[PDB]
Amino acid sequence: FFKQIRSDDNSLYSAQFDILLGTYCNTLNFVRFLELGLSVACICTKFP
Amino acid sequence: MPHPHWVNEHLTILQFIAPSNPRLRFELNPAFDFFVAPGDVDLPGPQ
Amino acid sequence: TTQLIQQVSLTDFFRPDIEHAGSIVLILRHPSDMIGEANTLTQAGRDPDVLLEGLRNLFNACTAPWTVGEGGGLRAYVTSLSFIAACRAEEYTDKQAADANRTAIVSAYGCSRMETRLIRFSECLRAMVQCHVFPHRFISFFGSLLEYTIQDNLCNITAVAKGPQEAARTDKTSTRRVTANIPACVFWDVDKDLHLSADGLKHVFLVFVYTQRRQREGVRLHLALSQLNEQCFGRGIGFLLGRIRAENAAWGTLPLVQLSNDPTSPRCSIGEITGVNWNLARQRLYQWTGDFRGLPTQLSCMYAAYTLIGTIPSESVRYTRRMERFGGYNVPTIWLEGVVWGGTNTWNECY
Amino acid sequence: AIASEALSLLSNTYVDGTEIDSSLRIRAIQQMARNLRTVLDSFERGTADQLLGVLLEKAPPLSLLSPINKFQPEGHLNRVARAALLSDLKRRVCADMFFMTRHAREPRLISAYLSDMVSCTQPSVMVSRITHTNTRGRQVDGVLVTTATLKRQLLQGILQIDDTAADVPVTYGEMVLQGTNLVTALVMGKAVRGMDDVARHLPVNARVPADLVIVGDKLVFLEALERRVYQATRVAYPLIGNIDITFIMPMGVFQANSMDRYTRHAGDFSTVSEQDPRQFPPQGIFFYNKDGILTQLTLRDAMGTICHSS
Amino acid sequence: RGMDDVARHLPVNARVPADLVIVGDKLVFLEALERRVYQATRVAYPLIGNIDITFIMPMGVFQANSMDRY
Amino acid sequence: AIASEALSLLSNTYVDGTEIDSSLRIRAIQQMARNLRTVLDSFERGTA
Amino acid sequence: ELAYVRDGVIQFEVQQPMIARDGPHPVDQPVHNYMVKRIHKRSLSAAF
Amino acid sequence: TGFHPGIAFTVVRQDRFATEQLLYAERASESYFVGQIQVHHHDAIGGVNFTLTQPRAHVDLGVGYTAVCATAALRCPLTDMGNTAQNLFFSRGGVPMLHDNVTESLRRITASGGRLNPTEPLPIFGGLRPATSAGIARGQASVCEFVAMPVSTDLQYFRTACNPRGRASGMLYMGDRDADIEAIMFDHTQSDVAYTDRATLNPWASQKHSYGDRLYNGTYNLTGASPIYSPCFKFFTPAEVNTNCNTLDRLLMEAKAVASQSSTDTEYQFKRPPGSTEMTQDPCGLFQEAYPPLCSSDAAMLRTAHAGETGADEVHLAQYLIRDASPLRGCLPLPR
Amino acid sequence: EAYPPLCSSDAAMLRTAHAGETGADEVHLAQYLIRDASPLRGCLPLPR
Amino acid sequence: VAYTDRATLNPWASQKHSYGDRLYNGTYNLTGASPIYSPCFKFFTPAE
Amino acid sequence: SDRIAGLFNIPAGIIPTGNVLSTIEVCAHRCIFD
Amino acid sequence: FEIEVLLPGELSPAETSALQKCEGKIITFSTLRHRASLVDIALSSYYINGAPPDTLSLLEAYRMRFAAVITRVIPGKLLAHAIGVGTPTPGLFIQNTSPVDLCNGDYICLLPPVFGSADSIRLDSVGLEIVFPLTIPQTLMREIIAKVVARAVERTAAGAQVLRGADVICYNGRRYELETNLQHRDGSDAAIRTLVLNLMFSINEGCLLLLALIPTLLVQGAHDGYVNLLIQTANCVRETFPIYETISSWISTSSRLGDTLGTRAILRVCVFDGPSTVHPGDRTAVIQV
Amino acid sequence: MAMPFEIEVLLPGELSPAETSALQKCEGKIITFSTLRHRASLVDIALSSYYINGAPPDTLSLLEAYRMRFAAVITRVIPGKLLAHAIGVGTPTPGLFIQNTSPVDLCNGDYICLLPPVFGSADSIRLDSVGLEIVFPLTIPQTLMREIIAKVVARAVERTAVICYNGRRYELETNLQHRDGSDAAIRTLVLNLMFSINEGCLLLLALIPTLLVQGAHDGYVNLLIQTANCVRETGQLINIPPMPRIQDGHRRFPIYETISSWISTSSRLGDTLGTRAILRVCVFDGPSTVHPGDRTAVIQV
């Protein structure tokens, strides 16, 4: 790149810029089975 | 001849508007009748 | 890692202690199937009893000629590339590289009944072409020679049927490793004859060449390197064998559009076909005689066959030529470095 | 899945690297932890999905299970009352194919359709164990899984809430199969669950926001699982089902020779044409579309079946 | 925006006239803005708008040979 | 020979809350040990 | 420094749950979505 | 041209509505079992891939029936209430016409009044699949079936829930013997079990080896190659009742989890995909009865001189109207 | 799409018997009358 | 699509280059110099 | 056929692990079990 | 790799005895999932169209599905290692279901039951049948189909026709005669009819296509001018009725039929210190391609 | 060799960020190298290497190149170089994937053949930094490769003298820019069409009047007889007298010869007028079908 300016030109001090105005996210709602309403209908059991 | 067209006049509008009519694409203007012909013959011409 | 096959066999066409470990060995189909395939596949006008006569003449000059019929289990399963290369040792172009192999294999097997078992084998292979049951249907690629153990006439053969050749531990001797090995008569790289490139992966093929000429035909066996896949190796060898292809082609042996376009031509219907009429079928419709007789066929014009048996996955393939002691004599050999044996021995014939 | 170009990163974790290298490893481990955490939730959701998978292919329709269960005396039917029960089911099924839309202006009948719904079944088993209950110590009976709008229509003016909290067990049972029921499994091929107990013969709750509703006189769980589970995940809610209904219509039938071709009044549908076009045999039938758009069906349409070599 | 908070890692009240309504199950505002603002100032009230209906009519048609003229 | 379904029971895989497989693994270990002992005695017989 | 800005972006990322099934269905894997927005510069005006 | 060839047909279509169900379950209806997770990995390209699998089991605990369901409300309907025929030229059947010109000119002419026709180049290995129309408007199109019948058949059979075969059938009418089921459906020296004043309404379809039977009864496999879904398959084919044990309360076993017989994703009702998974509720298929929708032998007979009121009149001068005795008599859009 | 208003072929079919109604009257002897199906079925001034 | 048996209802206004197409489709710009509104403009030219 | 029997004694009344509290005519529902 | 096929209950103790023997037979799934059911391998899944399939369609669907060898079976379920991908860690063994012998070093392929098939298992407590392919060598692959189609196109030409003879396929010092004593080969005559039909209609459409494009084929000497055209058109020498809707239809059909009959090998009988011959019914070691 | 044969194409470090972002997206596409090295350069796969006599090739010479040349799969594109896997030499290649580049969907199980771009224009890369345009072969099922190869060799013969699939039509844009490859294909078509005729073919030729009656007695044959634009015309227009007595007829069988030597010249007609099948789609646990642009899981043949 190459650029030749004489005494002065407007492009010398016109600085603009970019900005990252904030990051976001979201949390998950981990459900357990033994706290729903459906688990009344079944008798779970572990059996290795 | 025996290799019939343009005489399909017994049709009812349902068989005419149906896409199965090859004479449908040549219906484009109320005061015109489009058709095919032998090309580049400018006169009554020969028999 | 690799794989190994093990097969106990007789010791007629293969003596696995003069053979250098790393040579290639070939398997032989039961000979009683040729006498079944010859009845059907021989060409009309030739006595199929020539192959039967030669085959019976071969095993008479062999080891114990019993159970050589059907019920026999223990027989001569395996043969070496050197043996087939030494029986047809007159059809190879490099005479000096082939007659030495033949001399060494005759004087090395320690037998006088040899050189009468090599003349029979060549006559059998020549007959098998004349009766149209080619050797490419009764031989295939058993693995490279790795390790052996012998007894009185009984040998046990170990091979390597897959994977890299050099990743195979032979506990016997000499650096515990084994390298590929072929006699210099059978070797020829097509990429040099076709003037092709060098840098790249190369395949290793097994080529049978057939000449169709009555009572003086011939067959030989080759091991080729090439940068061409199996679908284009035929177009390759089809160019370096013109004088055999042409001579086999010629020394081994209906205007429907018009009438169908004539709307005045005599034509019957689907509802009129009663062919029992001697007029309606023969006299009325256009008569024509077929005479599909003596015309060139597939099994007649077939001049060559090949199968892919391995590959060499190097940048530049490197092979030597060192005259090795083949049990008393010295034969020009060729050492192939870094061969990874493929498989699925599917033969492709040329025409 | 642990992606490449990040397993090679996670591999050489003990090598003296750079800072721009060691700052991507934390990102890789964050990703792996996110995935491993969100996968184990999939089993806790798949349990609630599979239970509806099983509690849906095991339940007959209400319109058939209710009228049968009012016929228990004479357990073996005598081949005549069965015919009447059949002719009654065939007319009661068409009554309530959708018993919460056809009868939406009047909420009282819906509570009846639910009361006779819950009184139609039978209780399973009373195990000596702790069971689901509300705050005041009244044991619960059943569950009523619906869609989210059925809840809005039921909790409005039909089903009366009782309590908004319940305590439930929070630990499964256990089976160990060790001791003398291991020897019985290895030597012969059997085992018993409480084996040591017959050989002798010969648990914490948790209050959680729920919705317990009174129906009939029982206490049932009314919810809609299509928000807690099944949302943001592309697994269709199983309680939304498809119904098939076979229609038929007659085309071009002529009324036979009888007094069956009348007219209700004198001069109805009179045409200006000098003859009556109604007398002629009709050839086409007309029905309404899905969106109420009048269509046609004449004999010309059977040309695909009646003009074939079959 | 939070440049320091990442480069490190590596509210009064006032009583106002308001009118609130409970709509459904949420607490939300309900404001009309034609008195405090937009009054006697030459601006069109933006909550009033336009909408289009495209009417059509058949004219001069004749139902073909059928029983449809009764 | 060592059969598969025993060559997998000797694999240093995870642990399970079962003692069925703990019995299967010992069942396979004892078999492999019997086989190895008999094979090793085979050479003391074969020398003579 | 609004009159000195040219781009402004806000980032999101969301994590969705999944369900473990079995049968003729395909096994599932977690998804993570990323989205980016951008500001729309407007202005005012007044005089006397 | 407009010529009635002294014959009458019965159209048969099967719509489909998505519904909102409603389920009740009693405490301890199932005994659930959970085993042990074990994990295997399939080493992919450069990176790995894990898969968690956990074996489970379950068992009912009730002596009677512990759960019940109900089609509570109505969502939007899926398949339209349209008019599309099932052109049987799809099937590679048996004896064809003697002359190729006649079958070709027959297919070309029957493909000129519909759109479910096969493409004109007839393949060899495929199955004569139809075309893929660009736009879809109202839903999946449900095809109809036609059954020929005498012309002067009385209408009091088509006004209530009836059977297209004309003769009733099914396992609901029994006396608990195994030799009875075929006789109730096919034996004709007896009478129709529902209408005892005749033996059949459609002689050409009800009897064994008749037209409709030899055309639709799935045991002969005439339209085995056609991809289109055949509604009369569940009406003409005898249901396989070998799985019974002479119980007559298997009715409850026959009303739960019918797999979706058709396809639900395409533009037309094809047969089911082999890897399908859906379920449905077929009342009409169980009792072997259809329903008459609000239709008429005359288009101009439906309107009335006051808006919002559909015409319900019986007949007028050999032209009939049928008031709808279907389950959806209301709760569907009426023109206004 | 487009919506048809309350329109008729001839006026005599629009007008009613008693005051304050409309003329649904969908057909009479080759002359017709289409009833409205626009959003503005009501909400419009009529003659009395 | 809405009536899956026919292909049009006014063939002089649906097919390409027809009399209806040549009269309102903005692609051809026949009513260019006129200031009067075209109610069928959005119905005849294909949207982007 | 009939694999279930012979596994365990059908009248095996070792210790009931619960009650039924169902009191229905069970023979009418015979399709659901042995 | 390893697949578990859960055998349902109520399998009568005569069916489980049969499934005991089926260790070393090949089954074919449509898709490779770890959990498969007894319906996925049953005959009701090949089921190409309506009735059970034909010998042509089995050939079409044996190169389309995925094959798997059935390893150990236990009283409860049925294990099977998929072949093609996975590198079976144990000793993969096969039980040859074919009338011929198997040498040491062959390249096994699959082939529908083109003989008196007796590998069928009838599972009647559940209502489904399982048919296992034949594991024939590859040297006999071109011979068997050729003979079985020739012996049918010879049977169909009984109006426009020794008469019979030894139709023997001789492999590995043995003779096996295709011609069964039963002449009522119907059903099997029909199970292969759809194949012989296409083969004839594709041989003729090429024969009758060459004689409609070469006006100088057998008129310049059926021994002289034919071979000259052959040997000139062998290399690149120089330039050479719906006549253009027939060449395309011949290619687009005979090429597909050739792709059906390809049948590349899948296994290899590679024993290591065992028996060198694998009789019908025996089991031996197998390494896979 | 035990590891998969890796290839290392070296990208020029002077590209644009978009010129390399486009390469970042070409993971799973197939490229072909004249020789099989380990260190290839970007000039070995661009359209510069498919040059016959300094000119861009036609759809028939590119077809010959695709079967003359080695194949490989792009797997990942790092900022420095390009890593790729060889296909048809060394079997080990676990978890290999392939992006469906085609207009038509891919269903599970199909074999894969690769076509030069014929359906409209190609989706290619124009690396204007060094001046190389890179085209990628299509991915077409084998049951559809064989229709287009026929439709193009027929047009080649027509010169020297539309396709339906799953209910969707397409149009070809195949061109012939010269006249050498056309005849190099015509000679093979006629040769393979000439090695099928044998002595036993006449006994098959006498069954045409009988096949014409079985096409009227049956249903499956009546469709086969319509497409046979020759058997349907000869069976009513030509005749043959009975065949001569077979030379040594007590011994040999001609039909076995004519239908044994017929399968050979048909298991090659596809692999010579077109390209072979190198891969086949095997999605163990992924989706069933594959729309245009979605990666698949394949296993090499």
Coordinates of C-alpha atoms in Angstrom, one line a residue, chain C residues 14-307:
Chain C
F14 CA 8.0 -76.5 -5.0
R15 CA 10.9 -77.3 -2.7
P16 CA 10.8 -74.7 0.1
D17 CA 14.4 -74.8 1.2
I18 CA 16.2 -73.9 -2.0
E19 CA 13.7 -71.1 -2.5
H20 CA 14.7 -67.8 -0.9
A21 CA 12.3 -66.7 1.7
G22 CA 10.3 -63.8 0.2
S23 CA 9.7 -65.3 -3.2
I24 CA 6.1 -65.6 -4.3
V25 CA 4.4 -69.0 -4.5
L26 CA 1.3 -70.0 -6.4
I27 CA -1.6 -72.3 -5.6
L28 CA -2.9 -75.0 -8.0
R29 CA -6.5 -76.0 -8.4
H30 CA -7.4 -79.7 -8.3
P31 CA -6.5 -81.1 -11.7
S32 CA -9.6 -83.2 -12.0
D33 CA -11.7 -80.1 -12.7
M34 CA -10.0 -79.5 -16.0
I35 CA -11.4 -82.8 -17.3
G36 CA -14.8 -81.5 -16.4
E37 CA -14.5 -78.0 -17.8
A38 CA -12.9 -79.2 -21.1
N39 CA -16.0 -81.2 -22.1
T40 CA -18.1 -78.0 -22.2
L41 CA -15.6 -75.3 -23.1
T42 CA -13.5 -76.9 -25.9
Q43 CA -14.1 -75.5 -29.3
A44 CA -16.2 -77.5 -31.7
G45 CA -13.8 -79.3 -34.0
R46 CA -11.1 -80.3 -31.5
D47 CA -10.5 -83.5 -29.5
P48 CA -10.7 -82.7 -25.8
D49 CA -8.7 -85.8 -25.1
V50 CA -5.4 -84.0 -25.7
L51 CA -5.6 -82.2 -22.4
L52 CA -6.7 -85.4 -20.7
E53 CA -3.8 -87.2 -22.3
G54 CA -1.2 -84.6 -21.3
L55 CA -2.6 -84.3 -17.8
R56 CA -2.4 -88.1 -17.3
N57 CA 1.1 -88.0 -18.8
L58 CA 2.2 -85.3 -16.3
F59 CA 1.3 -87.0 -13.0
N60 CA 2.8 -90.3 -14.1
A61 CA 6.2 -88.6 -14.0
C62 CA 5.6 -87.1 -10.5
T63 CA 5.6 -88.4 -6.9
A64 CA 3.4 -91.3 -5.8
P65 CA 0.7 -91.3 -8.5
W66 CA -2.2 -92.5 -6.3
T67 CA -5.1 -90.6 -4.8
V68 CA -4.4 -88.3 -7.8
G69 CA -8.0 -88.8 -8.6
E70 CA -10.9 -87.4 -6.6
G71 CA -10.8 -88.7 -3.0
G72 CA -7.2 -87.8 -2.5
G73 CA -6.6 -85.1 0.1
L74 CA -2.8 -84.8 0.3
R75 CA -1.3 -83.7 -3.0
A76 CA 0.8 -81.0 -4.7
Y77 CA -0.9 -77.8 -3.8
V78 CA 1.7 -75.1 -4.2
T79 CA 4.2 -74.2 -6.9
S80 CA 6.7 -71.3 -7.1
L81 CA 7.0 -68.5 -9.7
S82 CA 10.4 -69.9 -10.6
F83 CA 8.9 -73.2 -11.7
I84 CA 6.4 -71.8 -14.1
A85 CA 9.1 -69.3 -15.3
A86 CA 11.5 -72.2 -15.9
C87 CA 9.1 -74.5 -17.8
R88 CA 8.2 -71.7 -20.3
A89 CA 11.8 -70.5 -20.2
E90 CA 11.9 -70.3 -24.0
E91 CA 9.1 -67.8 -24.5
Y92 CA 10.7 -65.0 -22.4
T93 CA 12.5 -62.3 -24.4
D94 CA 15.5 -62.0 -22.0
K95 CA 17.1 -65.4 -23.0
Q96 CA 20.2 -64.9 -20.7
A97 CA 18.1 -64.1 -17.7
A98 CA 15.8 -67.1 -18.3
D99 CA 18.1 -70.0 -19.3
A100 CA 20.1 -69.5 -16.2
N101 CA 16.9 -69.8 -14.1
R102 CA 16.0 -73.0 -15.9
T103 CA 19.5 -74.5 -15.6
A104 CA 19.6 -73.7 -11.8
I105 CA 16.1 -75.1 -11.2
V106 CA 16.9 -78.3 -13.1
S107 CA 20.3 -78.9 -11.5
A108 CA 19.3 -77.5 -8.1
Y109 CA 16.3 -79.7 -7.2
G110 CA 18.8 -82.6 -6.8
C111 CA 16.7 -84.8 -9.1
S112 CA 17.1 -86.5 -12.4
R113 CA 13.4 -87.1 -12.8
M114 CA 13.3 -83.3 -13.1
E115 CA 13.7 -82.0 -16.6
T116 CA 11.2 -84.8 -17.5
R117 CA 8.7 -83.2 -15.1
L118 CA 9.3 -79.7 -16.6
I119 CA 8.7 -80.8 -20.2
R120 CA 5.4 -82.3 -19.1
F121 CA 4.2 -79.2 -17.2
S122 CA 4.9 -77.0 -20.3
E123 CA 3.0 -79.4 -22.6
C124 CA 0.1 -79.4 -20.1
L125 CA 0.0 -75.6 -20.0
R126 CA 0.1 -75.4 -23.8
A127 CA -2.7 -77.9 -24.1
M128 CA -4.8 -76.0 -21.6
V129 CA -4.8 -73.0 -24.0
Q130 CA -5.6 -75.2 -27.0
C131 CA -8.7 -76.7 -25.1
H132 CA -9.8 -73.3 -23.9
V133 CA -9.5 -73.7 -20.2
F134 CA -6.8 -71.1 -19.5
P135 CA -4.2 -71.3 -16.8
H136 CA -5.6 -68.1 -15.3
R137 CA -8.6 -70.1 -13.9
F138 CA -6.5 -72.8 -12.1
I139 CA -3.6 -70.8 -10.6
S140 CA -3.7 -67.8 -8.2
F141 CA -1.6 -66.0 -5.7
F142 CA -0.7 -67.8 -2.5
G143 CA 1.3 -65.6 -0.1
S144 CA 5.0 -64.8 -0.2
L145 CA 7.3 -67.5 1.3
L146 CA 8.1 -66.8 4.9
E147 CA 8.9 -69.9 6.8
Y148 CA 8.9 -73.7 6.2
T149 CA 9.5 -77.1 7.6
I150 CA 10.2 -80.3 5.6
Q151 CA 10.1 -84.0 6.0
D152 CA 10.5 -87.0 3.6
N153 CA 8.6 -85.6 0.6
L154 CA 6.2 -83.6 2.9
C155 CA 6.5 -79.9 3.3
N156 CA 4.6 -77.4 5.4
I157 CA 4.5 -73.8 4.0
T158 CA 3.9 -70.5 5.8
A159 CA 3.1 -67.4 3.8
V160 CA 2.0 -63.8 4.2
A161 CA -1.3 -63.0 2.5
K162 CA -1.9 -59.4 3.6
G163 CA -0.1 -56.3 5.1
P164 CA 3.4 -55.1 4.7
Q165 CA 6.0 -57.7 3.7
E166 CA 8.8 -56.4 5.9
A167 CA 6.7 -56.4 9.1
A168 CA 7.1 -60.2 9.4
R169 CA 9.4 -61.9 11.9
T170 CA 11.2 -65.0 10.6
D171 CA 13.0 -66.4 13.7
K172 CA 15.2 -68.6 11.6
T173 CA 18.2 -66.6 10.3
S174 CA 19.8 -63.5 8.8
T175 CA 18.4 -60.4 10.4
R176 CA 15.1 -62.1 11.3
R177 CA 13.5 -60.3 8.3
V178 CA 12.5 -61.2 4.7
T179 CA 12.2 -59.2 1.5
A180 CA 10.3 -59.7 -1.7
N181 CA 12.1 -61.6 -4.5
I182 CA 11.5 -62.6 -8.1
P183 CA 13.7 -64.0 -10.9
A184 CA 14.6 -61.3 -13.4
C185 CA 13.1 -63.1 -16.4
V186 CA 9.4 -62.5 -15.4
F187 CA 9.9 -58.9 -14.4
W188 CA 9.0 -55.9 -16.5
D189 CA 7.6 -52.5 -15.5
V190 CA 5.1 -51.2 -18.0
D191 CA 5.4 -47.6 -16.9
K192 CA 8.9 -47.6 -18.6
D193 CA 7.7 -49.2 -21.8
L194 CA 4.8 -46.8 -21.9
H195 CA 7.2 -43.9 -21.0
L196 CA 5.3 -42.8 -17.9
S197 CA 6.2 -41.1 -14.7
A198 CA 8.2 -42.5 -11.8
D199 CA 7.3 -40.8 -8.5
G200 CA 4.1 -42.3 -7.1
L201 CA 2.5 -45.4 -5.7
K202 CA 2.7 -48.4 -7.9
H203 CA 0.7 -51.6 -8.1
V204 CA 2.0 -55.2 -8.6
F205 CA 0.2 -57.3 -11.1
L206 CA 0.3 -60.9 -12.3
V207 CA 0.0 -61.2 -16.1
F208 CA -0.7 -64.2 -18.3
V209 CA -0.1 -63.8 -22.0
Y210 CA -1.9 -66.1 -24.4
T211 CA -1.1 -66.9 -28.1
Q212 CA -3.8 -68.6 -30.1
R213 CA -2.2 -70.7 -32.9
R214 CA -3.0 -74.4 -33.3
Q215 CA -0.3 -76.9 -32.2
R216 CA 2.3 -74.1 -31.7
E217 CA 0.6 -71.8 -29.2
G218 CA 2.3 -70.5 -26.1
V219 CA 1.8 -69.0 -22.6
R220 CA 4.0 -67.2 -20.2
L221 CA 3.8 -65.5 -16.8
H222 CA 4.8 -62.0 -15.8
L223 CA 5.0 -59.7 -12.7
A224 CA 4.5 -56.1 -13.6
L225 CA 4.7 -52.7 -11.9
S226 CA 2.6 -49.8 -13.1
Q227 CA 1.0 -46.5 -12.1
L228 CA -2.2 -47.6 -13.7
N229 CA -5.2 -48.9 -11.8
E230 CA -6.8 -52.2 -12.7
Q231 CA -9.4 -50.6 -15.0
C232 CA -6.7 -49.1 -17.2
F233 CA -3.9 -51.7 -17.0
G234 CA -5.7 -53.5 -19.8
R235 CA -5.5 -50.6 -22.1
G236 CA -1.9 -50.5 -21.1
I237 CA -0.8 -54.0 -21.9
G238 CA -3.2 -54.0 -24.9
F239 CA -0.8 -51.7 -26.6
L240 CA 2.5 -53.5 -26.0
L241 CA 1.0 -56.8 -27.3
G242 CA -0.3 -55.9 -30.7
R243 CA 1.3 -58.7 -32.7
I244 CA -0.2 -61.2 -30.3
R245 CA -3.7 -59.6 -30.2
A246 CA -4.0 -59.4 -33.9
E247 CA -2.7 -62.9 -34.7
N248 CA -5.0 -64.3 -32.1
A249 CA -7.9 -62.5 -33.6
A250 CA -7.6 -64.0 -37.0
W251 CA -5.7 -67.3 -36.5
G252 CA -7.4 -69.1 -33.7
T253 CA -10.9 -69.7 -35.1
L254 CA -30.6 -57.4 -41.8
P255 CA -32.3 -54.2 -43.0
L256 CA -34.8 -53.8 -40.2
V257 CA -34.8 -50.0 -40.2
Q258 CA -35.8 -50.0 -43.9
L259 CA -38.6 -52.5 -43.8
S260 CA -39.9 -51.1 -40.5
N261 CA -39.8 -47.7 -42.1
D262 CA -41.6 -48.9 -45.2
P263 CA -45.3 -48.7 -44.2
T264 CA -46.1 -50.9 -47.2
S265 CA -43.8 -53.8 -46.1
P266 CA -45.3 -57.2 -45.3
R267 CA -46.0 -57.2 -41.6
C268 CA -48.0 -59.6 -39.3
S269 CA -49.7 -58.7 -36.0
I270 CA -49.6 -59.7 -32.4
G271 CA -53.0 -61.3 -32.8
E272 CA -52.0 -63.2 -36.0
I273 CA -48.9 -65.1 -34.8
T274 CA -49.5 -68.8 -35.4
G275 CA -46.0 -69.9 -36.3
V276 CA -47.2 -73.5 -37.0
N277 CA -48.0 -72.4 -40.5
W278 CA -45.3 -73.4 -43.1
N279 CA -46.3 -70.4 -45.1
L280 CA -47.2 -67.6 -42.7
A281 CA -43.9 -68.0 -40.8
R282 CA -41.4 -68.9 -43.6
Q283 CA -42.7 -67.8 -47.0
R284 CA -44.6 -64.6 -46.2
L285 CA -42.3 -62.7 -43.9
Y286 CA -38.7 -61.8 -45.0
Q287 CA -36.5 -64.9 -44.9
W288 CA -33.0 -64.8 -43.6
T289 CA -30.4 -67.4 -42.6
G290 CA -28.5 -66.8 -39.4
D291 CA -25.2 -68.7 -39.8
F292 CA -23.6 -67.6 -36.5
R293 CA -20.8 -70.2 -37.1
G294 CA -17.0 -70.0 -36.8
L295 CA -17.3 -66.3 -35.9
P296 CA -14.8 -64.7 -33.5
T297 CA -15.7 -65.2 -29.8
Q298 CA -14.5 -64.1 -26.4
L299 CA -12.6 -67.2 -25.3
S300 CA -10.9 -67.3 -28.7
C301 CA -9.5 -63.8 -29.0
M302 CA -8.4 -63.5 -25.4
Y303 CA -4.7 -62.8 -25.5
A304 CA -3.9 -61.9 -21.9
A305 CA -5.2 -61.7 -18.3
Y306 CA -4.1 -60.0 -15.1
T307 CA -4.9 -59.5 -11.4

